[PDB]
Symmetry: D3
Subunit: 282 residues, 6 copies
């Protein structure tokens, strides 16, 4: 059985940018088939409604087992409209968001939606005087490295893979939808890192990434004097750059012990595992 | 007046992952509106055809001024199907691809399509023993950093911005469609870097990135002994990691002179420019 | 005129460890004379009282113009005893402390005491399973670097030097006692860095250092499971190590422009100033 | 029983700055109680005499088991006055010093004093054109890192801990007083590093650090042309900065093997030990 | 049997600069004796002929068992003259060269000569506007690091050592002359590195060094506009600097496992082996 | 007119390895012609005598204007034989050596020989248990980087270029022979570095390199216990590695100001000069 899903991306988060690709990293899965629609970076009410309608139009013929909506702030107006449209729809749905999503966590459960809220997926320093396209991409490169090398992406991969198995068992109840809040302490329940200093450097990285959000928010929404806000948002980027260097450092530690966890998919969708570089994944 | 475009993403490249977002980095442009559809990482003929149909269905009501198709190897069968459907449609279309696209360069011009072929946008080490989702993300982070900090993304940004201005003049002829091949030497025609050592480090980073392709191709398509191919594809990732560090080091040299070029958009879509950290973009 | 002061150190903060030495960096000032007493790291009520008594006994003959008490948490019982004794004494006094001192800020003004509260002077990961003396010193080396290279110690140096000048004018009123809260944003009112990226790297370093406190507090005072709390306090130390790296990077940027601010004392106490390596301070 | 000691600090050395704190790193020992007194950075004959008298005055009621004098150059006139008063007093005494203390080593033994001379504890570049308070703190930060991560502070900690045990057996003869000269070669007699490269990197860092003294002495006491002496003292600081990195690199090696030695104190003053991050100290 | 050889150096390559020294690293071999002659950097026909004549004149009395000619491009005119003179001589001869030597590989075997062609031994950016003596030496230092720490110099050491043993067996047939082409993949057949990431980092270093050649060749022999060729050849040097860092990072990995391969000579010429730092080589 | 010289190399020093090549970096000088002879690493009396005889034999027909002998310790037996033979010959001669040559400095002037003694050209840790050919080459790469990037090679380049101009004026008196001792302080008389921190970093590097010699000597000639000498000589190599990193960091500083000094030769042997990357040397 081939599981089917539609991903909807409005605005951009590290996680929502990579979510579908984490699930079929070499395109050889024969057990999944995805459609991705979005309105690029725009996430106001009209755009989000238009994106969700695309999904729903496509769903009629595609018949997806579930739908995923990914982007910043589930509590904002645009994403709120999406939650509402998807809740009222026939399809099980999952919301991917960031720390601000916590404000509507209870609401989402009441709505019958799953969620994955990624606290370290921090808003960037979105002031015109600082953030051009190249800076926006550099920040995203640092963030992606943080979310990957600390193991956060593995947590997201797992959550969807478990859900895809349920989709293949043919009934997805609300009880099956993920309800995850991911942060620095998430790593304490996992066996991601063989070396405990690699773990605590990855924790520091997630801590700093999460702390980036408050700096950005202060610079974008609170401080009004550009003489103050430009430096403030630029300092949030210098942070994320260092979180990435910490995440890098953790990974090299795992390399030094020939212990880098890799969990690739087999063509039948099964998730394999290995540590040693020369060891076949199984 | 508002330019409209649909982006189609099948498979993944650093440039195709970011192309739409480079054009509206804070989501405040009032002069553009985009739709994005894709079949995620899958880019065989059926998936590509299904992706392009999504785009065309949506186009009926959306009425885009142009359509972009982005992903690996324009010469491959899936991307070949797309070029033909788009070349045969009523919509001006642009192909975003990598070095292997060079094989059908003349074909694409004959087809009446524009293209942007990014040679440093190198295929990764796609063998299951090595590439799991986290590794695929890590690679993508390094590559994004290279394409951003060396200024390749600015060349991309500029080509689409020029096209969007034409879309607003209301006629896009074949003469308007971009026809770009980007590589290490592209920097020599630009004024990206104020410091000439930042420039040559950035050139070294693009040269190493472009060299990664051959190593990945040897490891995925030529070498058949996994005792040899796993180290080979892994060494391609170590290369892209050091390319990213070179790009970083270049950008830090522009910092040391307070000379980082930023070219953000204004709400009306105009591209602004500045160098000094405290100077308003204009 | 020779100004005199007594410094009392109970417990240890980066700032209280260096406070007196920042005022006479080559021991050639002829206009100051200091005495320094303390009970080492112990800062419970009996020790703090004993420390302040030494100070007051010595003060009888020494006749200091002002007395400074420095160490962790002005709101804690030990430090609260010292504030009380110092407020009730005849000598103007200044409290050096960390973020937790903010809880008794209004109290201190009401007590007629000056203060300097250094938010980035963060508590370390004080769990026996992690913190031995070597780890404790490593943390203090990283923190000293942060507080020095970001310019925080320069803010402290100025505050006392202004006070010392008042002491020489012979009357210190409450109006003269410093009332400072130092943190990341402190750098925004200063001209410490010629290079604006050195400034924002230094702001990032201060932000991470202030963020370290919360991680330490969670690991020492909230989390009770040592399988959780050891990694937690260790991740706080990894953060401070990276903050030190940022502060270092900022300072190397100033070096690259031969713009490193130095403000040494002349023998008569006057504070000189220079930027260029070869330029005499004046 | 509770061992009591008074520390006297005149001038500054990395070792004298940290000596007392290395003995009670979390302030939970119930077996010791300390007083600290000093005249800050000033160490001429009259300051030192005043410092020592402070200690003697307090000692009448405090009744310490031993007194420690710490600061630069035991052979200098002020330190020499300290040795005279301490040698003549009733209290066992230890002298904490640097390499210049070697000139009065035999004298010290003849005086009945113990000593710990730390050759890597190098004089900084005390010229007004270069050394302001910030630069003095920066140096102290790199020095502290060197003395901590190479192990040197652990040799100190151990020596005082042994002495403290003899203080508790209630008689301290001259035979118990430490007589240590510490340098690069000290590591060869120890088991500080599990990894042999961490050791040799640590050795190199102590060698560079000891070499710093000669460059500082040349720049401060021999070269008289400021066009020569400013760059000379500045180069001594760049040395110490790289020594600090060597020491960091050594400790990261220990991390990679999960083999970082920690020897914390228990509440009763016993010195515990461990190597594995998760292992309880014992 | 003491084996005798003459080395001829015309032009410079990393390998030819170090070839003889790799065979007697502490000068304590009693089983070899060498003469070295050359014309420094000049390698045109006249100079090469003069160099080979020196060698042959000396050979009359010296009676070497074999002769080595080392330097750039065995296919160039100067080196072609040497191959002809050596082939026609009575002495077994080996040619050390770089990738361009591949054009005359078959020719050399037909000539009855041995060869070792080192692909990563890349031509530098020889344009007067960029390459002064200091730059030439810096590039050589990076290249030497690469060739050493990746294990390429060990391969060269072995080939000669095997030949030297044959020379002592008293007959060197053409069958004994080395016929090696060394590149990135050479590492796959060896057991140089205990850690597999050290290996792949070394492979990446060798790939980059090999890629340097093409960039230098483009900038020296193809591009004619100095506004383009100066940055081009400077970018080749930035590449080689990063290859050296990768090689360094590989070796530090081996240190982290106490597994650095060392194969020194014994006085009797026997090649010893060890991994652990404290283990006698055997 | 074309100046001619013979270089004799016995043993190895960073300077002697590069001395001839620093004089014709692209091989395009038409005003010089060189022969190079040596006995490789061996420098005992018989070998040195045999090397000097080769030179003198060749000199009969070559008619060199001067002869250079380069290698370790001009005071050792081998090199003493060379000095005597060269002093007694008809050819003006120059001795290239290291610090130990200082012992026979006066003797060399009495002998009528010139010299260049390079104190930072430090002996490596030549113990069999540590130094194999790869380690030997790694040390030489680090030292070469130090001697090049700090500007020491430029000093040597100048000295020979001045002598070469005299050789073309046709008479070389003893008054023309260089008599140089190079060390850290040599940089103070030069204008090598535009940035003063690059200068003091290069000084630090030369100080560390020069300090390496003492560590090597202790480990090779003094310490007899291999448990002590192996770590000792390996620590000298860690020092040289850090000295190379300081030299690198100095050069990157020069890059950040577009101020790297380049002094290439024109075809007629004239020494050109430039600082800006794009500026023609003149
Ligand atoms: C494309 C980007 N990619 C990402 N990628 C990741 N991973 N995470 C992200 O957060 C983002 N971004 C988050 N994004 C994001 C977040 C917040 C805001 C809101 C703005 O931060 C507020 O609206 C500021 O107030 C704008 O300030 C505005 O006002 C200032 C003065 O102008 P004036 O001259 O008009 O007065 C200017 O700086 C201007 O930008 C915009 C974009 C981007 C859409 C989006
Ligand atoms: C999602 C990834 N993101 C990217 N992102 C960027 N920026 N750039 C990229 O190139 C990619 N990837 C390119 N991708 C990509 C590219 C080429 C191949 C072709 C494969 O390399 C060939 O199919 C291999 O031959 C498969 O190898 C297979 O053969 C081995 C033996 O197993 P057996 O059990 O079959 O025997 C295993 O390694 C398995 O991996 C696959 C995926 C991914 C779809 C995609
Ligand atoms: C000497 C240090 N140097 C510094 N230097 C600087 N710059 N800044 C600092 O904050 C410090 N330190 C702050 N310091 C500091 C701060 C808080 C605590 C309190 C502790 O964090 C809590 O009281 C923990 O609960 C103790 O943990 C205790 O409980 C655990 C289980 O044992 P159980 O088995 O008895 O149950 C063990 O980890 C044990 O340590 C101690 C020391 C040090 C006194 C002091
Ligand atoms: C507070 C510092 N912290 C440390 N911390 C550690 N860990 N280690 C140390 O060595 C120190 N320092 C060692 N200390 C220290 C050591 C020696 C000198 C002696 C000075 O080096 C000589 O007395 C100079 O000659 C002064 O030079 C003087 O002469 C120059 C010309 O001016 P002009 O206008 O008078 O002619 C000026 O540069 C001036 O400083 C000073 C301070 C500092 C007190 C002290
Ligand atoms: C000394 C170096 N050491 C090495 N060491 C190693 N390890 N590897 C190497 O390749 C070398 N080098 C390679 N070598 C090498 C290689 C090629 C060329 C040929 C040059 O690349 C071309 O001949 C340029 O065309 C010269 O261009 C000339 O033209 C421009 C002025 O034009 P115009 O304005 O005069 O007309 C200037 O750039 C000038 O250099 C020279 C030397 C060096 C001799 C040699
Ligand atoms: C090849 C190297 N390249 C360089 N390159 C540069 N730039 N600079 C240099 O100085 C050198 N080296 C200096 N050279 C050099 C210098 C001194 C010694 C003297 C040796 O350091 C002593 O001869 C040791 O005492 C030997 O130790 C011997 O004893 C131990 C075994 O015990 P046993 O049981 O054999 O008795 C072994 O370590 C063995 O090597 C050797 C070589 C090398 C030939 C040469
Ligand atoms: Na603006
Ligand atoms: Na003094
Ligand atoms: Na350069």
């Amino acid at each position: 059985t081939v599981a089917k899903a539609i991903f909807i991306k409005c605005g951009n988060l590290g996680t929502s940018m990579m979510m579908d690709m984490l699930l079929d990293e070499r395109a050889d899965r024969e057990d999944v088939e995805f459609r991705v629609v979005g309105t690029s970076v725009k996430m106001d009410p009209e755009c989000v409604e238009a994106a969700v309608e695309m999904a729903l139009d496509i769903a009629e013929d595609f018949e997806p087992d579930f739908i995923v909506y990914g982007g910043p702030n589930p509590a904002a107006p645009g994403p709120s409209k999406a939650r509402e449209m998807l809740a009222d729809s026939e399809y099980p749905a999952v919301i991917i968001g960031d720390a601000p999503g916590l404000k509507v966590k209870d609401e989402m459960e009441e709505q019958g939606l799953g969620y994955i809220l990624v606290k370290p997926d921090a808003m960037l320093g979105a002031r015109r005087e600082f953030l051009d396209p190249v800076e926006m991409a550099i920040y995203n490169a640092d963030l992606m490295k943080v979310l990957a090398a600390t193991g956060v992406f593995r947590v997201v991969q797992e959550a969807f893979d478990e859900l895809i198995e349920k989709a293949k068992e043919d009934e997805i109840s609300e009880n099956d939808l993920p309800k995850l809040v991911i942060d620095r302490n998430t790593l304490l329940e996992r066996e991601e890192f063989e070396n405990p200093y690699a773990m605590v450097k990855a924790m520091a990285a997630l801590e700093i990434a999460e702390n980036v959000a408050d700096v950005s928010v202060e610079g974008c929404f609170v401080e009004q004097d550009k003489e103050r806000y430009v430096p403030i948002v630029a300092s949030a980027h210098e942070m994320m750059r260092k979180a990435a260097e910490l995440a890098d450092e953790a990974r090299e530690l795992e390399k030094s012990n020939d212990a880098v966890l890799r969990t690739p998919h087999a063509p039948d969708g099964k998730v394999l595992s290995k540590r040693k570089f020369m060891e076949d994944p199984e």
